[PDB]
Design an enzyme around this catalytic site. Structure first.
Site, PDB file in Angstrom:
ATOM      1  N   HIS B  51       0.849  -1.188   0.000  1.00  0.00           N
ATOM      2  CA  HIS B  51       0.000   0.000   0.000  1.00  0.00           C
ATOM      3  C   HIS B  51       0.881   1.233   0.000  1.00  0.00           C
ATOM      4  N   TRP B  80      -1.938   3.757  12.173  1.00  0.00           N
ATOM      5  CA  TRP B  80      -1.556   4.192  13.516  1.00  0.00           C
ATOM      6  C   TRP B  80      -2.725   4.404  14.444  1.00  0.00           C
ATOM      7  N   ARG B 126      30.858  12.467   9.611  1.00  0.00           N
ATOM      8  CA  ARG B 126      30.556  11.121  10.135  1.00  0.00           C
ATOM      9  C   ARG B 126      29.512  11.233  11.237  1.00  0.00           C
ATOM     10  N   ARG B 127      28.941  12.385  11.475  1.00  0.00           N
ATOM     11  CA  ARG B 127      27.924  12.597  12.494  1.00  0.00           C
ATOM     12  C   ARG B 127      26.605  12.928  11.839  1.00  0.00           C
ATOM     13  N   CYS B 146      10.376   1.951  16.549  1.00  0.00           N
ATOM     14  CA  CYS B 146      10.854   0.641  16.060  1.00  0.00           C
ATOM     15  C   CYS B 146      12.082   0.955  15.188  1.00  0.00           C
ATOM     16  N   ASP B 169       8.833  -6.412  12.738  1.00  0.00           N
ATOM     17  CA  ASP B 169       7.760  -7.319  12.293  1.00  0.00           C
ATOM     18  C   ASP B 169       8.109  -7.623  10.821  1.00  0.00           C
ATOM     19  N   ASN B 177       8.877  -0.302   6.255  1.00  0.00           N
ATOM     20  CA  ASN B 177      10.099   0.369   6.693  1.00  0.00           C
ATOM     21  C   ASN B 177      11.090   0.584   5.547  1.00  0.00           C
ATOM     22  N   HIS B 207      11.482 -10.502  13.859  1.00  0.00           N
ATOM     23  CA  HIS B 207      10.574 -11.621  14.086  1.00  0.00           C
ATOM     24  C   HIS B 207       9.393 -11.732  13.175  1.00  0.00           C
TER      25      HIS B 207
HETATM   26  C1  LIG Z   1      35.997   7.124  18.317  1.00  0.00           C
HETATM   27  C2  LIG Z   1      36.118   6.487  19.772  1.00  0.00           C
HETATM   28  F1  LIG Z   1      35.588   7.144  20.720  1.00  0.00           F
HETATM   29  C3  LIG Z   1      37.545   6.478  20.120  1.00  0.00           C
HETATM   30  N1  LIG Z   1      38.700   7.419  20.078  1.00  0.00           N
HETATM   31  C4  LIG Z   1      38.761   8.319  21.184  1.00  0.00           C
HETATM   32  C5  LIG Z   1      40.125   8.183  21.958  1.00  0.00           C
HETATM   33  N2  LIG Z   1      40.284   6.694  22.211  1.00  0.00           N
HETATM   34  C6  LIG Z   1      41.562   6.122  21.898  1.00  0.00           C
HETATM   35  C7  LIG Z   1      42.644   6.891  21.558  1.00  0.00           C
HETATM   36  C8  LIG Z   1      43.883   6.306  21.283  1.00  0.00           C
HETATM   37  C9  LIG Z   1      44.047   4.927  21.357  1.00  0.00           C
HETATM   38  C10 LIG Z   1      45.428   4.282  21.097  1.00  0.00           C
HETATM   39  O1  LIG Z   1      46.380   4.995  20.795  1.00  0.00           O
HETATM   40  N3  LIG Z   1      45.510   2.871  21.129  1.00  0.00           N
HETATM   41  C11 LIG Z   1      46.879   2.387  20.864  1.00  0.00           C
HETATM   42  C12 LIG Z   1      47.642   2.538  22.233  1.00  0.00           C
HETATM   43  C13 LIG Z   1      46.944   1.965  23.502  1.00  0.00           C
HETATM   44  C14 LIG Z   1      47.640   2.661  24.703  1.00  0.00           C
HETATM   45  O2  LIG Z   1      48.686   3.302  24.527  1.00  0.00           O
HETATM   46  O3  LIG Z   1      47.023   2.497  25.763  1.00  0.00           O
HETATM   47  C15 LIG Z   1      46.689   0.876  20.438  1.00  0.00           C
HETATM   48  O4  LIG Z   1      45.567   0.437  20.701  1.00  0.00           O
HETATM   49  O5  LIG Z   1      47.687   0.351  19.927  1.00  0.00           O
HETATM   50  C16 LIG Z   1      42.924   4.139  21.715  1.00  0.00           C
HETATM   51  C17 LIG Z   1      41.729   4.701  21.973  1.00  0.00           C
HETATM   52  C18 LIG Z   1      38.361   9.724  20.781  1.00  0.00           C
HETATM   53  N4  LIG Z   1      38.948  10.142  19.523  1.00  0.00           N
HETATM   54  C19 LIG Z   1      39.439   9.177  18.570  1.00  0.00           C
HETATM   55  C20 LIG Z   1      39.290   7.790  18.815  1.00  0.00           C
HETATM   56  C21 LIG Z   1      39.822   6.787  17.807  1.00  0.00           C
HETATM   57  O6  LIG Z   1      39.684   5.571  18.033  1.00  0.00           O
HETATM   58  N5  LIG Z   1      40.452   7.324  16.658  1.00  0.00           N
HETATM   59  C22 LIG Z   1      40.563   8.711  16.449  1.00  0.00           C
HETATM   60  N6  LIG Z   1      41.164   9.222  15.277  1.00  0.00           N
HETATM   61  N7  LIG Z   1      40.071   9.631  17.387  1.00  0.00           N
HETATM   62  C23 LIG Z   1      35.676   4.924  19.614  1.00  0.00           C
HETATM   63  O7  LIG Z   1      35.220   4.323  20.583  1.00  0.00           O
HETATM   64  N8  LIG Z   1      36.001   4.225  18.429  1.00  0.00           N
HETATM   65  C24 LIG Z   1      36.470   4.837  17.279  1.00  0.00           C
HETATM   66  O8  LIG Z   1      36.827   4.134  16.366  1.00  0.00           O
HETATM   67  N9  LIG Z   1      36.510   6.240  17.199  1.00  0.00           N
HETATM   68  C25 LIG Z   1      37.080   6.929  16.065  1.00  0.00           C
HETATM   69  C26 LIG Z   1      36.103   7.106  14.907  1.00  0.00           C
HETATM   70  C27 LIG Z   1      36.602   8.310  14.153  1.00  0.00           C
HETATM   71  O9  LIG Z   1      37.723   7.932  13.380  1.00  0.00           O
HETATM   72  C28 LIG Z   1      37.022   9.131  15.365  1.00  0.00           C
HETATM   73  C29 LIG Z   1      35.986  10.080  15.918  1.00  0.00           C
HETATM   74  O10 LIG Z   1      35.788  11.184  15.051  1.00  0.00           O
HETATM   75  P1  LIG Z   1      34.427  11.527  14.248  1.00  0.00           P
HETATM   76  O11 LIG Z   1      34.618  12.727  13.454  1.00  0.00           O
HETATM   77  O12 LIG Z   1      33.935  10.382  13.511  1.00  0.00           O
HETATM   78  O13 LIG Z   1      33.495  12.029  15.304  1.00  0.00           O
HETATM   79  O14 LIG Z   1      37.567   8.250  16.337  1.00  0.00           O
HETATM   80  C1  LIG Z   2       6.812  -1.151  14.960  1.00  0.00           C
HETATM   81  C2  LIG Z   2       6.506   0.024  13.889  1.00  0.00           C
HETATM   82  F1  LIG Z   2       6.241   1.213  14.381  1.00  0.00           F
HETATM   83  C3  LIG Z   2       5.353  -0.475  13.110  1.00  0.00           C
HETATM   84  N1  LIG Z   2       3.945  -0.788  13.441  1.00  0.00           N
HETATM   85  C4  LIG Z   2       3.209   0.373  13.815  1.00  0.00           C
HETATM   86  C5  LIG Z   2       1.892   0.617  13.026  1.00  0.00           C
HETATM   87  N2  LIG Z   2       2.323   0.468  11.538  1.00  0.00           N
HETATM   88  C6  LIG Z   2       1.584  -0.466  10.708  1.00  0.00           C
HETATM   89  C7  LIG Z   2       0.503  -1.237  11.220  1.00  0.00           C
HETATM   90  C8  LIG Z   2      -0.175  -2.100  10.409  1.00  0.00           C
HETATM   91  C9  LIG Z   2       0.124  -2.223   9.045  1.00  0.00           C
HETATM   92  C10 LIG Z   2      -0.693  -3.133   8.138  1.00  0.00           C
HETATM   93  O1  LIG Z   2      -1.515  -3.907   8.652  1.00  0.00           O
HETATM   94  N3  LIG Z   2      -0.401  -3.072   6.768  1.00  0.00           N
HETATM   95  C11 LIG Z   2      -1.294  -3.812   5.827  1.00  0.00           C
HETATM   96  C12 LIG Z   2      -2.265  -2.797   5.222  1.00  0.00           C
HETATM   97  C13 LIG Z   2      -2.082  -1.329   4.766  1.00  0.00           C
HETATM   98  C14 LIG Z   2      -3.483  -0.606   4.841  1.00  0.00           C
HETATM   99  O2  LIG Z   2      -4.493  -1.284   4.846  1.00  0.00           O
HETATM  100  O3  LIG Z   2      -3.435   0.656   4.842  1.00  0.00           O
HETATM  101  C15 LIG Z   2      -0.354  -4.458   4.826  1.00  0.00           C
HETATM  102  O4  LIG Z   2       0.796  -3.941   4.864  1.00  0.00           O
HETATM  103  O5  LIG Z   2      -0.815  -5.330   4.116  1.00  0.00           O
HETATM  104  C16 LIG Z   2       1.157  -1.419   8.529  1.00  0.00           C
HETATM  105  C17 LIG Z   2       1.845  -0.525   9.317  1.00  0.00           C
HETATM  106  C18 LIG Z   2       3.015   0.434  15.285  1.00  0.00           C
HETATM  107  N4  LIG Z   2       2.693  -0.857  15.888  1.00  0.00           N
HETATM  108  C19 LIG Z   2       2.919  -2.020  15.222  1.00  0.00           C
HETATM  109  C20 LIG Z   2       3.544  -2.059  13.966  1.00  0.00           C
HETATM  110  C21 LIG Z   2       3.794  -3.343  13.201  1.00  0.00           C
HETATM  111  O6  LIG Z   2       4.340  -3.298  12.102  1.00  0.00           O
HETATM  112  N5  LIG Z   2       3.371  -4.524  13.866  1.00  0.00           N
HETATM  113  C22 LIG Z   2       2.759  -4.466  15.123  1.00  0.00           C
HETATM  114  N6  LIG Z   2       2.381  -5.670  15.667  1.00  0.00           N
HETATM  115  N7  LIG Z   2       2.501  -3.262  15.777  1.00  0.00           N
HETATM  116  C23 LIG Z   2       7.750  -0.045  12.845  1.00  0.00           C
HETATM  117  O7  LIG Z   2       8.094   0.979  12.232  1.00  0.00           O
HETATM  118  N8  LIG Z   2       8.238  -1.279  12.482  1.00  0.00           N
HETATM  119  C24 LIG Z   2       8.014  -2.467  13.175  1.00  0.00           C
HETATM  120  O8  LIG Z   2       8.487  -3.491  12.663  1.00  0.00           O
HETATM  121  N9  LIG Z   2       7.278  -2.456  14.327  1.00  0.00           N
HETATM  122  C25 LIG Z   2       6.898  -3.650  15.071  1.00  0.00           C
HETATM  123  C26 LIG Z   2       8.044  -4.341  15.752  1.00  0.00           C
HETATM  124  C27 LIG Z   2       7.263  -5.030  16.852  1.00  0.00           C
HETATM  125  O9  LIG Z   2       6.813  -6.224  16.349  1.00  0.00           O
HETATM  126  C28 LIG Z   2       6.188  -4.081  17.245  1.00  0.00           C
HETATM  127  C29 LIG Z   2       6.516  -3.071  18.391  1.00  0.00           C
HETATM  128  O10 LIG Z   2       6.611  -3.849  19.634  1.00  0.00           O
HETATM  129  P1  LIG Z   2       7.852  -3.637  20.626  1.00  0.00           P
HETATM  130  O11 LIG Z   2       7.626  -4.532  21.849  1.00  0.00           O
HETATM  131  O12 LIG Z   2       9.019  -4.056  19.887  1.00  0.00           O
HETATM  132  O13 LIG Z   2       7.842  -2.152  20.822  1.00  0.00           O
HETATM  133  O14 LIG Z   2       5.916  -3.237  16.010  1.00  0.00           O
END
Ligand SMILES: *C1=[C@@]2(F[C]2N2[C]([C][N]C3=[C][C]=C(C(=O)[N][C]([C][C]C([O])=O)C([O])=O)[C]=[C]3)[C][N]C3=C2C(=O)[N]C([N])=N3)C(=O)[N]C(=O)N1[C]1[C][C]([O])[C]([C]OP([O])([O])=O)O1
Ligand SMILES: *C1=[C@@]2(F[C]2N2[C]([C][N]C3=[C][C]=C(C(=O)[N][C]([C][C]C([O])=O)C([O])=O)[C]=[C]3)[C][N]C3=C2C(=O)[N]C([N])=N3)C(=O)[N]C(=O)N1[C]1[C][C]([O])[C]([C]OP([O])([O])=O)O1
Lengths: 264, 264
Positions: B51, B80, B126-127, B146, B169, B177, B207
């Site tokens: 759907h 929901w 990397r954040r 979930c 599920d 998902n 599961h």
């Molecule tokens: C992240 C984390 F939370 C790590 N880390 C930290 C500090 N810790 C450490 C330092 C140094 C070391 C060494 O040197 N080792 C050597 C020696 C031993 C002694 O002397 O005792 C061997 O083993 O041979 C160890 C430990 C904070 N900051 C950083 C770190 C690392 O690891 N690297 C860098 N470049 N810095 C965990 O838990 N794990 C991991 O792997 N990590 C990393 C990832 C990346 O690359 C970084 C962060 O940045 P972002 O931008 O992504 O946020 O780190």
């Molecule tokens: C969790 C979650 F947040 C899901 N879910 C929800 C709501 N959503 C839904 C419901 C139902 C459906 C159906 O039936 N579909 C049919 C039709 C369409 C029309 O008609 O429109 C077909 O597809 O054929 C869809 C959607 C909330 N709650 C719940 C759910 C599910 O899925 N299952 C149940 N039993 N409940 C997400 O996101 N995911 C997932 O996977 N989940 C699950 C996991 C488990 O198994 C549960 C929770 O518990 P704990 O203890 O872990 O927290 O869910």
């Protein structure tokens, strides 16, 4: 480790040249995913020596809700020095977000506690997540979260965790993010009486900095050894109670370390 | 689509039985990732007619920062309906967090505008992200996002997007998902003069509800057809200017629709 080494080769084979914030230039890919079964062994990189001390200390610091490097200093960890202000502050990074994400209504949510409570009373929840991605405070952070959001899952009496890493320095950050999340799973798993499942890592901009290419090819020429084994010697009263000492890594025999410069 | 049916098959072959919140029961896998090259056609399921009007309005509803199903009604979109209140409010869901994330201090950050500005002024960034996972307002939503978190990437004049879907599920939700985000890549890509790249989908708890077993089997036996193509008939002056009439699909020859109960 096999998975890690395959990601590297992937960057090299399919990465595009990109300019970046640090003005260094990268080779990047977008969207990747690898799975580590924590029962196979502890995912600590062996084709290069990793610094466990730094890894563990950093996580204990996350769990405390700290964002000042003083703690890291007392323990000789200087991985965050470069982003720290004159006062040792990083702004509301990880530890504040995990332990006290500020809500619009003057409240503060402890996400680790929340997760812990969920893993015990409602492990089938599809909402078991921690986000460091707090949009209202990004502008006050030394750097925005790299490892920004994670989700747990229990099935068969095993805890699994999946991480969404928005930006990943493959050579320097990645080995660190993997051993860290893995140790988190083991810690969570111990507190909840779960067995370790899988650590699934997903990436956003996954890249190699242009100045890490030789070290990259060197590493790749090495063959991984058997993964180490984590041994926790105690069961603290709370997740928040682990000490550097409760942890022991056995069978770690990696190739020589390889130095590379961090892009700032 | 081939990626989709393979995932449907994977839940059946490997999903573990879980008792969910709705009380229906589901077959589940943790962590999966599929990629769609938007260059190869629009990812709209062809093994079941989708759907398109529901998909479009929902999206345009989001971009407006509307949390009220009123607007969904006028366009005869009832998806929901069951989670809205007696007023038709869902709480600060998607629309509200995309267009006005309430900061701790009383401000509001327009994540969509920000992403546009980033794509136009700092594409290498990397954040480039939009999060609907506002931890502070989760208790106010009718249901938690979930589709939680998504991130844009630009490489070689192409715009890619990656979505983290925490709960999914496969049967009802998934096809909705995938085409919703694809549609977004397209309106983003055009307001910012980029070509479309990849649509990467990553899920948490993926599961099949146990009362979709039939429909799933019915769907698992049809041959996917060629993907349609999307035509944006006009270039609105801003991304908050699309309209239903602006979009046209072509070559959508779907297999007949499939009816399924929604788990509430
Ligand atoms: C992240 C984390 F939370 C790590 N880390 C930290 C500090 N810790 C450490 C330092 C140094 C070391 C060494 O040197 N080792 C050597 C020696 C031993 C002694 O002397 O005792 C061997 O083993 O041979 C160890 C430990 C904070 N900051 C950083 C770190 C690392 O690891 N690297 C860098 N470049 N810095 C965990 O838990 N794990 C991991 O792997 N990590 C990393 C990832 C990346 O690359 C970084 C962060 O940045 P972002 O931008 O992504 O946020 O780190
Ligand atoms: C969790 C979650 F947040 C899901 N879910 C929800 C709501 N959503 C839904 C419901 C139902 C459906 C159906 O039936 N579909 C049919 C039709 C369409 C029309 O008609 O429109 C077909 O597809 O054929 C869809 C959607 C909330 N709650 C719940 C759910 C599910 O899925 N299952 C149940 N039993 N409940 C997400 O996101 N995911 C997932 O996977 N989940 C699950 C996991 C488990 O198994 C549960 C929770 O518990 P704990 O203890 O872990 O927290 O869910």
């Amino acid at each position: 480790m096999k998975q890690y080494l395959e990601l590297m080769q992937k960057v090299l084979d399919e990465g595009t040249q990109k300019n970046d914030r640090t003005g260094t230039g990268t080779l990047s890919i977008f969207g990747h995913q690898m799975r580590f079964n924590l029962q196979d062994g502890f995912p600590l990189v062996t084709t290069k020596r990793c610094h466990l001390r730094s890894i563990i200390h950093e996580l204990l610091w996350f769990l405390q809700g700290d964002t000042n490097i003083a703690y890291l200093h007392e323990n000789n960890v200087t991985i965050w020095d470069e982003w720290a202000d004159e006062n040792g502050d990083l702004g509301p990074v990880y530890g504040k977000q995990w332990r006290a994400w500020p809500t619009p209504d003057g409240r503060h949510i402890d996400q680790i506690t929340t997760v812990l409570n969920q893993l015990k009373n409602d492990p089938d929840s599809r909402r078991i997540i921690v986000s460091a991605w707090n949009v209202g405070e990004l502008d006050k952070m030394a750097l925005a979260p790299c490892h920004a959001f994670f989700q747990f899952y229990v099935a068969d009496g095993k805890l699994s965790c999946q991480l969404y890493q928005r930006s990943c320095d493959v050579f320097l950050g990645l080995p660190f993010n993997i051993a860290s999340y893995a140790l988190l799973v083991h810690m969570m798993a111990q507190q909840c009486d779960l067995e370790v499942g899988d650590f699934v890592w997903t990436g956003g901009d996954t890249h190699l900095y242009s100045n890490h290419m030789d070290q990259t090819h060197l590493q790749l020429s090495r063959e991984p050894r058997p993964l180490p084994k984590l041994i926790i010697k105690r069961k603290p009263e709370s997740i928040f109670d682990y000490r550097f000492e409760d942890f022991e890594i056995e069978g770690y025999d990696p190739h020589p370390g390889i130095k590379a410069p961090v892009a700032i």
